[PDB]
Amino acid sequence: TTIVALKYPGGVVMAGDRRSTQGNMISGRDVRKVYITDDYTATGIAGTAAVAVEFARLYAVELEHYEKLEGVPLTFAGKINRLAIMVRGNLAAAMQGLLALPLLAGYDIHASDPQSAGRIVSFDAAGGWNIEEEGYQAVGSGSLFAKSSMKKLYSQVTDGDSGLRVAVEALYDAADDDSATGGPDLVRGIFPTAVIIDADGAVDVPESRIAELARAIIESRS
Amino acid sequence: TTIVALKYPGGVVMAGDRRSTQGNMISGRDVRKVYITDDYTATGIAGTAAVAVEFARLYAVELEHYEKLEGVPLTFAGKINRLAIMVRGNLAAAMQGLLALPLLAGYDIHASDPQSAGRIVSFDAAGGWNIEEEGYQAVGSGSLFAKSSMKKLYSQVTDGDSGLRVAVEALYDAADDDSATGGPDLVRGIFPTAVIIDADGAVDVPESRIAELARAIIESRS
Amino acid sequence: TTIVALKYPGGVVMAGDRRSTQGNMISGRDVRKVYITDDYTATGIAGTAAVAVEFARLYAVELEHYEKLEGVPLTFAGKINRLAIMVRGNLAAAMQGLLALPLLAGYDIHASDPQSAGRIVSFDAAGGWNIEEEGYQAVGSGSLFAKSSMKKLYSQVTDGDSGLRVAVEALYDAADDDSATGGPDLVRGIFPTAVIIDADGAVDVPESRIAELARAIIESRS
Amino acid sequence: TTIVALKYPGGVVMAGDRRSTQGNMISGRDVRKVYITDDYTATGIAGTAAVAVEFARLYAVELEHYEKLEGVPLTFAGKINRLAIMVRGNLAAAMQGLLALPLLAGYDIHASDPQSAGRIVSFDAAGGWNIEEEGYQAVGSGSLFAKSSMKKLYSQVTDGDSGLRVAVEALYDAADDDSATGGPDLVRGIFPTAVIIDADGAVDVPESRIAELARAIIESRS
Amino acid sequence: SPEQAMRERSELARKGIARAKSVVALAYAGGVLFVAENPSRSLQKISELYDRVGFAAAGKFNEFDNLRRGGIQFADTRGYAYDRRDVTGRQLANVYAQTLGTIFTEQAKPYEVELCVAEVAHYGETKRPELYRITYDGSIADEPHFVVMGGTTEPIANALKESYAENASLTDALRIAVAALRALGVASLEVAVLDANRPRRAFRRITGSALQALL
Amino acid sequence: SPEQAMRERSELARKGIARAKSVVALAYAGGVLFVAENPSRSLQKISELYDRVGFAAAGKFNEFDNLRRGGIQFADTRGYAYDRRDVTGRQLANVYAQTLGTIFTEQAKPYEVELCVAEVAHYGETKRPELYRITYDGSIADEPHFVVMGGTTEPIANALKESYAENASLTDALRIAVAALRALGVASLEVAVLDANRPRRAFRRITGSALQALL
Amino acid sequence: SPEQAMRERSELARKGIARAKSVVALAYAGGVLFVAENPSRSLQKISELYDRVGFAAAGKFNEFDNLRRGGIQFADTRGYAYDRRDVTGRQLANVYAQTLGTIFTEQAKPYEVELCVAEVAHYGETKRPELYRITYDGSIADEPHFVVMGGTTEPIANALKESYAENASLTDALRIAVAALRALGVASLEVAVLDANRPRRAFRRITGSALQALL
Amino acid sequence: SPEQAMRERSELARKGIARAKSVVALAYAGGVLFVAENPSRSLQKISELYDRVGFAAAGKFNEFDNLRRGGIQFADTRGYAYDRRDVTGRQLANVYAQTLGTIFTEQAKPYEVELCVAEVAHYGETKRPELYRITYDGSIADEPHFVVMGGTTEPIANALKESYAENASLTDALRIAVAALRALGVASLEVAVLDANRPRRAFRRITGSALQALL
Numbered sequence A, B, C, D: 001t002t003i004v005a006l007k008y009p010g011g012v013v014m015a016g017d018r019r020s021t022q023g024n025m026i027s028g029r030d031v032r033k034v035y036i037t038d039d040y041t042a043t044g045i046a047g048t049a050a051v052a053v054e055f056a057r058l059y060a061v062e063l064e065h066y067e068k069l070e071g072v073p074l075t076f077a078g079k080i081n082r083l084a085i086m087v088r089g090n091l092a093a094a095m096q097g098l099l100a101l102p103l104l105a106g107y108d109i110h111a112s113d114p115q116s117a118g119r120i121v122s123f124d125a126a127g128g129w130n131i132e133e134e135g136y137q138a139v140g141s142g143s144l145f146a147k148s149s150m151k152k153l154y155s156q157v158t159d160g161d162s163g164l165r166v167a168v169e170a171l172y173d174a175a176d177d178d179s180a181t182g183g184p185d186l187v188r189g190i191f192p193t194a195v196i197i198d199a200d201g202a203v204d205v206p207e208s209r210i211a212e213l214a215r216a217i218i219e220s221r222s
Numbered sequence E, F, G, H: 001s002p003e004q005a006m007r008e009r010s011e012l013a014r015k016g017i018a019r020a021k022s023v024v025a026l027a028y029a030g031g032v033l034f035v036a037e038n039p040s041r042s043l044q045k046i047s048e049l050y051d052r053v054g055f056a057a058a059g060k061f062n063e064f065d066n067l068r069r070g071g072i073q074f075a076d077t078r079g080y081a082y083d084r085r086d087v088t089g090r091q092l093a094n095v096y097a098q099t100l101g102t103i104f105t106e107q108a109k110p111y112e113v114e115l116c117v118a119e120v121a122h123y124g125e126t127k128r129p130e131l132y133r134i135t136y137d138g139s140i141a142d143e144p145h146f147v148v149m150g151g152t153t154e155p156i157a158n159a160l161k162e163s164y165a166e167n168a169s170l171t172d173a174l175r176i177a178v179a180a181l182r183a184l185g186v187a188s189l190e191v192a193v194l195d196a197n198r199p200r201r202a203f204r205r206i207t208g209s210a211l212q213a214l215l
């Protein structure tokens, strides 16, 4: 499992793979690991699948409940605090074998400068959170390879297309180096999933663009 | 124990064996492992027998209770959520030696296209559920052999008869490879049990058809 | 992690580094470890990050709550007692791997002599507190090296500038001797953080002065 | 840590050292270990510092609370019972590493003979108390050496000055034989602390007299 | 005597309802439209309960605010319990009726409120919108065309009955409702709609320049 | 009969309010100004609830002191729960209205209090200040210009209405409020302001030589 | 009717206060002086609450003894909670006012007590002593010069007002208080002082030969 | 009205006290002497509370038996809590006063009892014995010479006042008490003493041939 997120001038882009394994046996081929929490926020959780889906559905319900009750949406710090509390509450279950690690991406509409409005937040198993300032982050078992690839490929990002290409390349490198991460499937036609957040909101990326980018990358590497 | 389920154009078919063992000693020869929960849903549970019967009777009572209380039946996602909650609640008893793993088959009447209305859902020991998209699934100790047989025999399925024959063949292969699965008995006259769900509801398959199919398969293999 | 605090005629100065590690892997490069609790008090916590931030935010909220409720701020002994109670309450979590150790610096406005109004308080894992009388203190994993450096460099302190230079030099020595402490970064431009408390209140030190002092120290050592 | 107490015709004298250690590392140089509970009683606690301060502050508050509530002070036996209850309540925390052992000195104003009105009480870890009848007692890790020195030096005590000199000599011997006990510091000017209780109440001894006595003893030993 | 107590409580509730403003809910081709006369921009009388459910109230603000909060809690807990598509307005109306009956029976002072619950069809489906009216004593009724609550409703009801037209447009329905309520500019007006054409959430407010353009 | 009980309780609350002093809250260019006539220097009627929220009360001191403490508790717990910027004065006003309604309904003796909550904008932002008035029975209202509570408010209200000027200065607003209240030196005067220009905390008192200089 | 119940309870409390003795608290250069007429040597009306706080009461002994014990408990728990220097008399007065109001509202029989709390400055500091008076219904007031409670206080109040002198000595203040109370030897007299010159504890009684020498 | 309820309860208690027998407690050189007229040899009215404390009661037996048991429980628990020498009669009197006040205020029927607590000095010490009287409503008083409770006490009080002699002997005090009570052989007489000369326990009964010899 590997989920990447990065910033471009105008917003953020988040991408994730589709492989689910049970030890060394492949169990799932088209799992979706990226969710749209609200109009300007996306979350990606790694670890036990059931805990991840439960956390995602609970977080979405809590945000919607607050928005309906108070008539106004929460600020970014409030959402970070709620997610940190949810993560901290699972420490006892995080031990003994039910662990979930989230990653958050968002667009701040209250920021003075619209260009620097994209935010990426990472979390730890004890509930501590950190706001990234380097422009990219990765979570999962193949996060080190993806981070090392982005460290070299980040100079090419100029807009959304460049960032999406860099994210796909990082996922490809992570799948190349890790056996628990699923690479592109050309026999079946399964590709990673991406979400792009900008001033107009959060939109899912169509699969044709990702397929074209993956084919171009595969041709380049060959 | 092995329970198989598969999709055909028009609906779903589920099949199961009849052997019950206590270690290496044979204890039961005509156990029924497939239940009709309601008019459009079937469930098959593997593991400890008592837990399986308790889970089945409880699930049926809960569905009927909701239908009587609200005057309208639950949707498919609601039934999946209820089953997942029931499975998740037994985690502590799943450890230390009381484990039950279910498999669900159903027909969705709210689907726009009646042809693609059959659904197969699998579950894990932690309560996570997955909706199958390949067309077949198997649960139990002999599930790997049955899945590997269906992977090769799925190209022949065209209608209900073809699917039933494929399911019987998969059960036969699973019994051939596993000693905890019961094969056809010709001395006594005991055969696996099957349920077929289509637009008209869920119907039990008469034993004569299954006996004929098993005899044909045995003659072919000889 | 290393946090130093020292006294000069007129007030106190507290300084801290910016490195966060997970074992032998570097995780954070620009972490802030020094907080301004109120108009005349500063706190610095070492250990687990999440516990430290939680302790800091809780302490600030408690002080503000008392000030708003009673219409008058607490005395120094009351603040020490509250911090000691907060530390003592985490003993069970301090064992098994969630440990936080604070250090407190402050200016007493009720003291008869304004020159000798700076106070430095240290704490232990059981909740015991001690008021320093030698003029300096350090906390963290590199505290011994910083203390040994200050023991020799304390004779030069005359005013705020001298104390700030001595604090930066002590942090530099601690980073030289310890690998878990972050030194000055000239490639990126990241420097330690300092807070100065005097009769006018507590003020954050601008980064330009610290950069100049660090460059001067590096040139001197070369 | 070593605290001594002894009787002279007219009252009692209690003395204590100032060293605090964390294993083999010296942590504190001017710790005060002797408290004035009320007008005619003094207490000295050895062990964990935080537990000792908590016990002392709690005992003083309880005595003052009873005096204010009933309009009359408690008798000596009542104070002994309260201290014994407080000690007995910490047995569970005394095990596993939070141990505090007190020693009590007092002057009884209800005694028929004013000469024999000084009382010394010792306690054990289970809450049992004993009233001394030999004229001296010591508590701490160096108590054996101090007791053996007083056993030989007790014949010289005639009044308060003689008793104070004997107490200082016993503390000096205890510091000579034990490394966890602090001796006189002539470089820094730190000396043990003493309290004298007589018919007029309990008074702290000024540091000049103790410094003179320590210098005389050091000159004699040289 | 129980009769005198019930009569006095009913009279108190009737006076409290009668000394309040008027809220009107209409059904048009696009869904449900709520119109109220409210000068304040911070206190609202029309709210959203769930994806396709809308809530309107007449009476004391602090009395139906609690009811609205409770309804939102029930809907979110039921949606997480089974599914989002298993939540309907009839269950909310029944819960409101039970709560109001219990309050009218046991509490010292009855609530002076009148409630209306509106529901529209899901996206991509055709179905008649449903309107339920709940009174202070716990009575629940189903209204096929329109609901008028608060104040003197007889002239408004007569005007709406004489002027109601099925399958009307948004502007025509808004003008008809405004004319019926008059018998009212940008200020002192609160207008909300349940848009059946919206994908997931149907509730939306019309305020500002758009309201004047449509008026 | 419930009518007689409610009428008697309302009359008791009205008398208790009428036999009290007067508090006046005004909105000027710099924010919100609170003026009260209080001789004691130890008991205060104007207080701060949060960073940009201010509280004023008229009536019995021991009755609204508890309300003030409860409001501070709610604000601090909510600020720690989500964030400091997620706390607004409308929530505090709603909580106060619910508490006052519950007290008036259930308690043996109703509270003889009148409450006012004021809120200003955050630093670096432009927004109209908000003023909410809460009565003994639980009614909550929004006032755009000024709030006058306690004693005989009709002459003060008339004077303020005739003399109110928008976007006034601090000295002019203070003099206008003092003139309206007269119809009062350093002593027997309590003046507080919510400074919208302050970075984080906006509440501050004006007492001593500064008050005389501005008077 | 609530009015009749409140009037009857107030009348009962007024009679209970009126049929009691008189206690007088004065402020002089050395601090606060309490003078009461009490023949018994075992039951006391003047007590110490904390280091610099003093308590006086008039009425039924068993009724204010419980209040005194509760005040001591509050002070000791707060002193151990934060610090000894964080305890003031205003908090004790507020707690007493809340307790008395709750008793007067809920209990079947109101307390027939009148309470006075006095506070002086810390050692080495200059500050005016503070005197707070608390009545049966929960009202709290601040008195700058003197407090007279119990019995017919009008002649005593008039005599004290005509004869009060600021910055008086101990003997002169004692004689003035005795003369005011007369309008009384060693017996039937209880005299206490809060000595602002004492290091830590300020409360002390003057009884025996010293009282006669100073009389 | 509370006045009528309090008056009726006080009248009931007064009648209950008036229809009872008489108990007399005197102070002589050897300590305290209790004399009562009681024919039964199994039910007793004079008892011992602690080492130097004695208890006497007048009224209904089953009503003050519970009070006596409670007092013994309090004394033993306090003695084990701190020490035996930290227990005094004033604390017991205060506890009895609080209990009687609570019973008179809250219970449906007030207790028809009159209580007396006597205390003497410790062994080897000189001190005046202390006598405290507690009534049904909770009032507590200190009596220096003698206590007379139950029945018509005016003639007995007058006779004792005219005939009381300080520092009297045991026989003279007994004869004086008997003469005062008459205005009575071995039977229908209960005599007890608190012997201040005894080492630890001071209470002892005088019955049988010794009583006749001393009579």
Ligand SMILES: CC(C)C[C@H](NC(=O)CNC(=O)c1cc(Cl)ccc1Cl)B(O)O
Residues within 6 Å of the ligand: A001, A002, A019, A020, A021, A022, A027, A028, A031, A033, A045, A046, A047, A048, A049, A050, A052, A140, A141, A180, B124
């Ligand atoms: C979203 C999620 C797929 C994340 C990934 N985790 C897993 O796949 C872990 N696997 C299971 O939990 C699991 C899956 C099944 Cl089908 C059966 C049993 C188990 Cl034990 B990842 O690589 O970190």
Ligand SMILES: CC(C)C[C@H](NC(=O)CNC(=O)c1cc(Cl)ccc1Cl)B(O)O
Residues within 6 Å of the ligand: B001, B002, B019, B020, B021, B022, B027, B028, B031, B033, B045, B046, B047, B048, B049, B050, B052, B140, B141, B180
């Ligand atoms: C429905 C059920 C038959 C499923 C199958 N499980 C078992 O047979 C396990 N067996 C027992 O539970 C059991 C049966 C008896 Cl008679 C006595 C003791 C035991 Cl321990 B399967 O192969 O997975």
Ligand SMILES: CC(C)C[C@H](NC(=O)CNC(=O)c1cc(Cl)ccc1Cl)B(O)O
Residues within 6 Å of the ligand: A124, C001, C002, C019, C020, C021, C022, C027, C028, C031, C033, C045, C046, C047, C048, C049, C050, C052, C140, C141, C180
């Ligand atoms: C303020 C704090 C940074 C103090 C320092 N402590 C740590 O860095 C300890 N590290 C973590 O807690 C931690 C950090 C992350 Cl990103 C992930 C996992 C862990 Cl386990 B110090 O050197 O004492």
Ligand SMILES: CC(C)C[C@H](NC(=O)CNC(=O)c1cc(Cl)ccc1Cl)B(O)O
Residues within 6 Å of the ligand: C124, D001, D002, D019, D020, D021, D022, D027, D028, D031, D033, D045, D046, D047, D048, D049, D050, D052, D140, D141, D180
């Ligand atoms: C009054 C007290 C100083 C008595 C003495 N005990 C100790 O010094 C034990 N030491 C600590 O408790 C302690 C002190 C610090 Cl600074 C940090 C950690 C620890 Cl673990 B003694 O010698 O018996």
